[PDB]
Amino acid sequence: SGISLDNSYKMDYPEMGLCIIINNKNFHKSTGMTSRSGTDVDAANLRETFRNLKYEVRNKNDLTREEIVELMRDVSKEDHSKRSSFVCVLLSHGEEGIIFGTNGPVDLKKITNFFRGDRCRSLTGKPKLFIIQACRGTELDKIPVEADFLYAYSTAPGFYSWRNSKDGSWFIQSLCAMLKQYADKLEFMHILTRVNRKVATEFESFSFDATFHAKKQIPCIVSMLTKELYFYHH
Amino acid sequence: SGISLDNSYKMDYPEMGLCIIINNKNFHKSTGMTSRSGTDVDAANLRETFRNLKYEVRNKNDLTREEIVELMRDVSKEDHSKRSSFVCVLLSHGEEGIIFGTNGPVDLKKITNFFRGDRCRSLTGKPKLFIIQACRGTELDKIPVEADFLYAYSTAPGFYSWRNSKDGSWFIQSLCAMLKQYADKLEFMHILTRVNRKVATEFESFSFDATFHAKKQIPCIVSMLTKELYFYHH
């Protein structure tokens, strides 16, 4: 054959892969965590968006910390040989490096470690995308086993992340809109960059509380990918 | 005079000192933090307890993060020359190293730094006690400027701290009971040790949620004191 380049991930496997959406809206009273109004809008938006990208979407609602770990463990033990990639979307409360189950926190590392290059062989060398809509603090504005991971954080390290009770979270709203408009044209990093601009320029908080009023947000793309990622092929 | 020993803090100054009680019960809706039912019982219990110890108690309710810092700054700028010690009680939500104002978190270091040996000269060499009833995580069960500080934590590092909506927090209930019974007999560390035993043996959570049910708690005494502390003198 002619000259071959390996600058982009092979996305023409029989299946694009799984898109696991963990939508946590209602939390156990004992946790003292509020209901995440609008997250259902996000979950539905994501389901539709990734459905159009040909991902096998599995929407899960209100999972405990135990259920989250078990689900991720089970998913990581599946045969992903015929799958091009893996996507996991986490919609919940959170802190830096943490995502909340309905009854308590789960270390993000715990979840992501299941898919490490040496722990999930059928996904080795394939893009593993983790999209996280959760706060990361309280501020207001052979190959490496960690390789091939992409973390699309809704907000910068140490900052709160905003969610509108009616329209859904700023990040997810923007992500879905950009994926819908550019998934068949742009490389993923460029799509996430558009998401960054959309969130940073089109949103500002409105609150009766001066402390939380007129605040801005900037998402945070964390890439350990080794190749360009296009959702389309050939 | 005869042989003199300097094993205990001089507690016979004209005044025992200030006892600042920050009682945060209701938080701004935007923070998503629950109301701390029972904390008023704690605040009243502490006020009475320290009143009997002859401390100049100042009860503050529902202070924002800005108000907490300002209060502590102002208090640290007062003349404590005629005061034997300083006590600050913090009742609020919290995380490891953090205490919540009604509208957001405050680094505990921020608060305590105001009273460092080199920043509050009228308190240099005197015991500075910080009693903290707040969670420290989500787990369930010349002289140094940092010298002369005592941190009476309600719970161990990384753990939740329990509060009963009717009787008040486990730690504060126990602390006040032990101070009332032993303040005129035992050295402070021994009193806090009794508090540890009382909390560890007399309390167990009851919750309809299996995750938070039948849990135990152990307070955490952190001492940087250089002398024994007796609330009584001569």
Partner: peptide, 4 residues
Amino acid sequence: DEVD
């Protein structure tokens, strides 16, 4: 608008 609410924070997560």
